[PDB]
Amino acid sequence: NSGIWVLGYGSLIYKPPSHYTHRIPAIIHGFARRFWQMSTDHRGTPANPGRVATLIPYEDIIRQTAFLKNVNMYSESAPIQDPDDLVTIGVVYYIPPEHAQEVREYLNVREQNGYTLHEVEVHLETNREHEAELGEMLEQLPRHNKSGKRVLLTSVYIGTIDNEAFVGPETMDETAKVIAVSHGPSGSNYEYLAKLEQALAQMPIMKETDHYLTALLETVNKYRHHHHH
């Protein structure tokens, strides 16, 4: 078999697949990350479902007024004019052939709650070590005409707007109250958001932006420790 490239944009950024051998920062164009997937098994419960991350493609954004309004509200590029105006940061992992089959099965079970497997293009933000170890591969990837970055086809888990766990569109006030208090077998819903925002904030990817995630964390923090009990 071949190896696999797996894109992480939520908890896979800071709780990675097993056995990976490369981990590269990745610019995902044409998708917005939203906390519009409910979690009844990890970060919430059947009685009180949490919220976890999913990616919403441009082609779905432009099919509902509520989605288009929400992306413009939080984006510097408002009004969003084209798919490349939507930017989400993540990382891509390489799993070598010897482990790809087993890691795929682990990730399928880890993401069982409504995610499906897709293939998307990302722009790589490589460092010099990546360029030393993977230069022969990078030279064979196309360079994007606008960004000048190498473009890589990578697999990705996405809760599509059709899946049973999808709760979008949801206003930030409603999403933040749920994240502030939900808690499941994996831990608090708050930890999932806070670790994701920290893992992105601590990535050495500079400004060359969708403010949703930082706005969400700010709202969650205001609601935290102000529950009725």
Side-chain angles (χ1 to χ4, degrees), residues 2-14 16-58 60-68 70-81 83-100 103-108 110-112 114-127 130-132 134-145 147-163 165-207 209-217 219-221 223-224 226-229:
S2 295
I4 52 176
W5 290 94
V6 182
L7 175 61
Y9 56 87
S11 68
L12 285 167
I13 296 172
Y14 58 83
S18 34
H19 301 116
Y20 74 85
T21 57
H22 303 292
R23 182 182 186 271
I24 307 177
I27 313 312
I28 309 149
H29 289 271
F31 290 85
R33 178 206 286 112
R34 292 293 181 273
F35 269 62
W36 289 352
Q37 182 81 349
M38 64 185 126
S39 176
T40 57
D41 272 297
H42 290 333
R43 297 290 175 171
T45 62
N48 299 118
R51 303 284 185 272
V52 293
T54 184
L55 297 176
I56 305 151
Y58 182 80
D60 291 338
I61 292 285
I62 56 176
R63 285 167 173 177
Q64 279 174 239
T65 57
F67 286 1
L68 192 58
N70 182 286
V71 155
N72 282 332
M73 268 175 67
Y74 293 105
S75 152
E76 293 179 337
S77 282
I80 297 323
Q81 313 267 126
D84 282 353
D85 290 354
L86 301 171
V87 173
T88 298
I89 305 303
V91 289
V92 293
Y93 296 91
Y94 184 72
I95 324 295
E98 37 282 33
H99 297 123
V103 177
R104 178 58 77 207
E105 161 65 5
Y106 165 76
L107 294 174
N108 290 341
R110 184 171 156 170
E111 316 290 338
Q112 179 58 296
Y115 291 79
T116 44
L117 193 58
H118 305 263
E119 292 166 1
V120 301
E121 299 180 329
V122 301
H123 298 208
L124 299 178
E125 173 74 351
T126 51
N127 62 40
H130 294 136
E131 287 154 30
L134 289 165
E136 299 93 334
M137 181 195 77
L138 295 163
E139 286 164 3
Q140 299 302 319
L141 297 181
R143 271 208 200 277
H144 188 270
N145 299 283
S147 82
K149 315 289 194 194
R150 301 298 183 170
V151 179
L152 176 70
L153 196 68
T154 177
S155 68
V156 64
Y157 291 89
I158 292 173
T160 65
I161 66 184
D162 304 308
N163 90 91
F166 189 77
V167 303
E170 188 173 69
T171 65
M172 177 157 294
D173 178 56
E174 303 222 317
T175 307
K177 288 183 291 197
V178 168
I179 292 170
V181 299
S182 296
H183 188 129
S186 298
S188 70
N189 202 164
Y190 177 79
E191 163 184 55
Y192 174 106
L193 174 57
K195 290 188 169 189
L196 171 58
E197 187 277 339
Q198 287 159 21
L200 294 166
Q202 292 167 20
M203 280 191 58
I205 285 196
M206 296 305 105
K207 245 304 184 186
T209 307
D210 179 5
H211 291 319
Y212 169 86
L213 194 70
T214 54
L216 178 58
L217 180 54
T219 304
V220 165
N221 282 336
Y223 274 120
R224 287 285 270 185
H226 271 307
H227 187 266
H228 177 271
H229 273 135

